[PDB]
Amino acid sequence: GENVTLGRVALVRVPNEQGLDKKGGTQWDSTQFSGDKIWGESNKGSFGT
Amino acid sequence: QQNELTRNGAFHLNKENYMVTANDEFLLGYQVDPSSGEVSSYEPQPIN
To answer: Are B8 and B24 within 8 A, CB to CB?
Structure first.
């Protein structure tokens, strides 16, 4: 009966999503036109849930 | 001053949050205040 939080999922938003470069397997990476990866939680500020 | 006229509206954002075209060419627009009404300054400048 020990209910403990193990972490929380990280959510990444880039200013220019169109500029993300396409890797394989429905994945992307940050590039110089995509901006820098903005690390944030979910449901905070401009991030979704 | 160095601006060119176009018609297509395929715009997007860049890393600096400037509305640009596909070629990373910056759009121009009028400066209006958050409380202003009509155009305040008629000299164009990039939209932020």
So the answer is: no
Q: Could you tell me the two tokens for A12?
A: 């990444």
Quick one: how far is CA B33 from the chain centroid? 15
DSSP secondary structure string for all residues of B1-48:
-----------EE-TT--EE-TT-PBP-EEE--SS--S-SEEEEE---
Q: Does B23 touch chain A (CB under 8 A)?
A: no
Chains A & B: contacts with CB separation below 8 Å: 22
* Gyration radius of chain B over CA positions: 12
Q: Is B17 on the interface with A (CB under 8 A)?
A: yes
Q: What is the resolution of the experimental data for this entry, in Å? A: 3.2
* Method for structure elucidation: cryo-EM
A32 vs A11: CA distance, rounded Å: 20
